[PDB]
Design a protein around this ligand. Structure first.
Ligand SMILES: [Mg+2]
Length: 481
């Protein structure tokens, strides 16, 4: 029997009817033509029209041809239309946030080493989850495809442009870096060329990779959980994946999104009785929306519509050197790290350290008598200024060994008054480095000297009950990497 993650559906509608009205498109023009040729900022969202969006092309007056599979509807002759009446998955995952960002950015064919769909991070996932180095990330999208539209990058495209949009591009003052930035901000660095109309259901999840069942990959487990929530798991998938799904829900935070179809049936797609999902699916036909990309040609660079080589190269250069790095930097998010440790001592387990500090919940005199003692950490957020120093190493010293150079030494005795050796935690900090900064510290205890380290952690040598009895006790560290 299976625990499924609970949430509220976020239903999105795009503004397509209003975009069509603005373009003056006839109702015989296939749904989706209004989105082809839209100026696009590829940083903001995954396969969403930004409310900004300006059409470059005059599809109202362009020559049309009938859609063969949909009698009575028309598409510009230049636009290829492919029927695709199917349900497919567009799944992205990463073992780390940066790996998830790469995997998102490269889920479609867009050139440049940037955080391309990372504006989605602020709604797909939550702040604390994004910055927890214990977490991996999945985005499961089931697309309810009806058709796709493709605009091939043909030499005749400038001619199809709205005259005012063509003039605006041609008169861009490309000696002025601020004008080029503004043009990218207000019309786009790209334009849409390969879009899928229909519906989508999305489950975006942050999962504790150090605690979830590892029989299967998080992508597989996340997809099985999605299928659970929508009533689409077979009896065999339930038997095989049920335990994994339960673990997933115990160790994940999930976000539910629906687009396309009837908004009144959207809440309910994740109920999951199959009939509830299916009633939403069956509504997609009557209200398609832009939901996914044609992966091979999602969009073209806007300077391909420049008349001249000189203007195109000034715009490409500005993109790579100024505008895109500025955009991509708004989504550079690194995990919280530890920058300071204190020790707390007291007469019970409910003692609390001072305000910035959280207890590792293991009495460092466990089984040995004496005070309740807790190692406590301060979590620091990463900021591209400076940032600050990360704890990179912990070293336990005993009795009268000298503080190693230059470690800080916490002067409280991790054996007080349980007897035994005098035990002292030391640590060093260095300039923040992703390869080095300790994200998490824990403490383990056991009845034998050589304990199992928590998955992903390293044990710090030095028993924190050394010379007393009780348990063997070690600090352990985790570097997300
Ligand atoms: Mg102790």
């Amino acid at each position: 029997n299976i625990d499924l993650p609970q949430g509220l559906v976020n239903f999105s509608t795009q503004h397509l009817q209003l975009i069509r009205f603005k373009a003056g498109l006839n109702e015989t023009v296939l749904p989706g033509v209004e989105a082809i040729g839209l100026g696009y900022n590829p940083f903001i969202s995954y396969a969403s029209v930004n409310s900004g969006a300006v059409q470059l092309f005059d599809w109202a007056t362009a020559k049309k041809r009938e859609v063969p599979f949909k009698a009575g509807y028309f598409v510009p002759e230049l636009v290829d239309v492919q029927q695709n009446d199917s349900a497919t998955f567009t799944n992205v995952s990463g073992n780390t946030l940066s790996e998830y960002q790469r995997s998102l950015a490269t889920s479609v064919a867009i050139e440049g080493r940037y955080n391309f769909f990372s504006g989605s991070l602020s709604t797909d996932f939550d702040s604390n989850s994004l910055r927890n180095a214990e977490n991996e990330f999945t985005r499961i999208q089931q697309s309810i495809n009806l058709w796709s539209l493709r605009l091939p990058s043909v030499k005749s495209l400038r001619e199809l442009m709205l005259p005012h949009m063509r003039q605006q591009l041609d008169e861009l003052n490309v000696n002025d870096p601020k004008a080029i930035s503004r043009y990218f901000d207000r019309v786009g660095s790209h334009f849409l060329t390969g879009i899928v109309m229909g519906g989508r259901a999305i489950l975006a999840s942050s999962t504790n990779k150090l605690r979830v069942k590892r029989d299967y990959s998080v992508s597989v487990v996340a997809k099985a959980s999605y299928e659970g929530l929508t009533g689409q798991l077979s009896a065999e998938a339930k038997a095989k994946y049920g335990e994994s799904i339960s673990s997933f829900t115990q160790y994940s935070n999930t976000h539910q999104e629906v687009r396309g179809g009837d908004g009144a049936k959207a809440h309910g797609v994740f109920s999951g009785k199959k009939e509830d999902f299916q009633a939403w699916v069956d509504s997609v036909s009557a209200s398609p929306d832009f939901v996914d990309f044609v992966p091979t040609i999602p969009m073209q660079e806007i300077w391909t519509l420049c008349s001249s080589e000189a203007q195109a190269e000034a715009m490409r250069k500005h993109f790579d050197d100024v505008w895109a790095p500025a955009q991509s930097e708004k989504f550079r998010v690194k995990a919280n790290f530890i920058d300071q440790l204190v020790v707390l001592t007291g007469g019970s387990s409910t003692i609390e350290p001072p305000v910035g500090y959280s207890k590792i919940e293991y009495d460092l005199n466990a089984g040995a008598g004496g005070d309740f003692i807790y190692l406590c950490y301060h979590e620091q957020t990463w900021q591209a200024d400076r940032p600050k120093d990360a704890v990179t190493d912990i070293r336990i010293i005993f009795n009268k060994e000298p503080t190693p150079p230059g470690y800080t030494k916490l002067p409280q005795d991790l054996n007080k008054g349980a007897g035994g050796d005098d035990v002292f935690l030391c640590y060093k900090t260095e300039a923040f480095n992703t390869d080095t900064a300790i994200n998490k510290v824990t403490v383990i205890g056991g009845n034998n000297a050589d304990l199992n380290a928590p998955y992903g952690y390293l044990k710090v040598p030095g028993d924190l009950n050394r010379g007393a009895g009780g348990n063997f006790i070690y600090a352990c560290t985790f570097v997300g990497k």
